[PDB]
Design an enzyme around this catalytic site. Structure first.
Site, PDB file in Angstrom:
ATOM      1  N   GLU A   1       1.084  -1.052  -0.397  1.00 40.15           N
ATOM      2  CA  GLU A   1       0.206  -0.040   0.209  1.00 40.15           C
ATOM      3  C   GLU A   1       1.414   1.615   0.315  1.00 40.15           C
ATOM      4  O   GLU A   1      -0.165   2.042  -0.531  1.00 40.15           O
ATOM      5  CB  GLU A   1      -0.976   0.063   1.627  1.00 40.15           C
ATOM      6  CG  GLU A   1      -2.153  -0.531   1.037  1.00 40.15           C
ATOM      7  CD  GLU A   1      -3.142  -0.741   0.212  1.00 40.15           C
ATOM      8  OE1 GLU A   1      -2.816   0.396  -0.701  1.00 40.15           O
ATOM      9  OE2 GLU A   1      -3.540  -1.323  -0.181  1.00 40.15           O
TER      10      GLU A   1
ATOM     11  N   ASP B   1      -6.473   6.943  -4.925  1.00 39.32           N
ATOM     12  CA  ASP B   1      -5.394   5.366  -5.127  1.00 39.32           C
ATOM     13  C   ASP B   1      -5.522   5.141  -6.662  1.00 39.32           C
ATOM     14  O   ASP B   1      -5.884   6.378  -7.801  1.00 39.32           O
ATOM     15  CB  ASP B   1      -6.217   4.333  -4.110  1.00 39.32           C
ATOM     16  CG  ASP B   1      -7.265   4.646  -4.783  1.00 39.32           C
ATOM     17  OD1 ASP B   1      -8.573   5.276  -5.554  1.00 39.32           O
ATOM     18  OD2 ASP B   1      -8.290   3.359  -3.956  1.00 39.32           O
TER      19      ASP B   1
ATOM     20  N   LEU C   1      -9.145   4.639   2.734  1.00 37.58           N
ATOM     21  CA  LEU C   1      -9.714   4.829   2.413  1.00 37.58           C
ATOM     22  C   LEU C   1     -10.753   6.091   2.786  1.00 37.58           C
ATOM     23  O   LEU C   1     -10.917   5.750   3.848  1.00 37.58           O
ATOM     24  CB  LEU C   1     -10.358   4.346   1.163  1.00 37.58           C
ATOM     25  CG  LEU C   1     -11.489   4.998   0.859  1.00 37.58           C
ATOM     26  CD1 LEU C   1     -11.050   5.940  -0.631  1.00 37.58           C
ATOM     27  CD2 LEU C   1     -12.967   3.898   0.824  1.00 37.58           C
TER      28      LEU C   1
ATOM     29  N   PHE D   1      -8.593  -6.439   2.447  1.00 38.17           N
ATOM     30  CA  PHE D   1      -8.160  -4.881   2.837  1.00 38.17           C
ATOM     31  C   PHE D   1      -8.095  -3.912   1.895  1.00 38.17           C
ATOM     32  O   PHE D   1      -8.337  -3.202   2.292  1.00 38.17           O
ATOM     33  CB  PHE D   1      -6.712  -4.966   3.657  1.00 38.17           C
ATOM     34  CG  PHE D   1      -6.546  -3.834   3.868  1.00 38.17           C
ATOM     35  CD1 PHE D   1      -5.766  -2.711   5.452  1.00 38.17           C
ATOM     36  CD2 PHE D   1      -5.696  -2.553   2.917  1.00 38.17           C
ATOM     37  CE1 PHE D   1      -5.577  -1.982   5.809  1.00 38.17           C
ATOM     38  CE2 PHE D   1      -4.578  -1.600   3.144  1.00 38.17           C
ATOM     39  CZ  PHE D   1      -4.772  -1.276   4.732  1.00 38.17           C
TER      40      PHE D   1
ATOM     41  N   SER E   1     -13.002 -19.133  -6.099  1.00 36.41           N
ATOM     42  CA  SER E   1     -11.368 -19.950  -5.885  1.00 36.41           C
ATOM     43  C   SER E   1     -11.839 -19.509  -4.455  1.00 36.41           C
ATOM     44  O   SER E   1     -10.281 -20.611  -3.783  1.00 36.41           O
ATOM     45  CB  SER E   1     -10.876 -17.917  -5.815  1.00 36.41           C
ATOM     46  OG  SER E   1     -10.246 -17.170  -6.884  1.00 36.41           O
TER      47      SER E   1
ATOM     48  N   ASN F   1      -7.750 -18.991 -10.857  1.00 39.92           N
ATOM     49  CA  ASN F   1      -8.760 -18.551 -11.746  1.00 39.92           C
ATOM     50  C   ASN F   1      -8.780 -17.287 -10.476  1.00 39.92           C
ATOM     51  O   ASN F   1      -9.667 -16.326 -11.188  1.00 39.92           O
ATOM     52  CB  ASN F   1      -9.368 -19.380 -10.404  1.00 39.92           C
ATOM     53  CG  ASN F   1     -10.922 -18.791  -9.747  1.00 39.92           C
ATOM     54  OD1 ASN F   1     -11.905 -18.035  -9.598  1.00 39.92           O
ATOM     55  ND2 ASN F   1     -11.943 -19.064 -11.270  1.00 39.92           N
TER      56      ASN F   1
END
Ligand code: CL
Ligand code: CL
Length: 162
Positions: A11, A20, A32, A104, A117, A132
């Site tokens: 990040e 972002d 965020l 996250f 998945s 996948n």
């Protein structure tokens, strides 16, 4: 290696409001702030989160604080999720970090939609799950990071993070 270091790697760390990869206002270690395009709305949300008049800027400590709350929130969200919980608890520790990462980044919501998945991971079909997982918007829009997470799920080791 642990979740914090891993996510810190994916990040980054920025002390001034920023946009972002999707163009949304965010700050710190991927925190965020809002999906709205009004910078002001962003500053507001920032002050409310921090508890003071920030004027769009925070300290490292503040950032780290938000990051802790955020990691914590994610785990908790995973645990509270009926689609997620079971998968998560079936995995080893490394792989667990990989699930936290995704959550996250994309929310409980989004991950919850990776049904196939999810099942693959639950059944321990690593290679399969990995392919996948790559057939997704997620990988297409942020491929280097997605690659790292996926390899994490694929291998159960920290090699992608070197
Ligand atoms: Cl907060
Ligand atoms: Cl990326």
């Amino acid at each position: 290696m642990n979740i914090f270091e891993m996510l810190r790697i994916d990040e980054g760390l920025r002390l001034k409001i920023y946009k972002d990869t999707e163009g949304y206002y965010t700050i710190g270690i991927g925190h965020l702030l809002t999906k709205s395009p009004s910078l002001n709305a962003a500053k507001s949300e920032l002050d409310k989160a921090i508890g003071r008049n920030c004027n769009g800027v925070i300290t490292k400590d503040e950032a780290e604080k938000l990051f802790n709350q955020d990691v914590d929130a994610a785990v908790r969200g995973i645990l509270r999720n009926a689609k997620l919980k079971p998968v998560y608890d079936s995995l080893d520790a490394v792989r667990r970090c990989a699930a936290i990462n995704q959550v996250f980044q994309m929310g409980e919501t989004g991950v919850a939609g990776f049904t196939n998945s999810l099942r693959m991971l639950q059944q321990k079909r690593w290679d399969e799950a990995a392919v996948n997982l790559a057939k997704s918007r997620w990988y297409n829009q942020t491929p280097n990071r997605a690659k790292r997470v996926i390899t994490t799920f694929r291998t159960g080791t920290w090699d992608a993070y070197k």
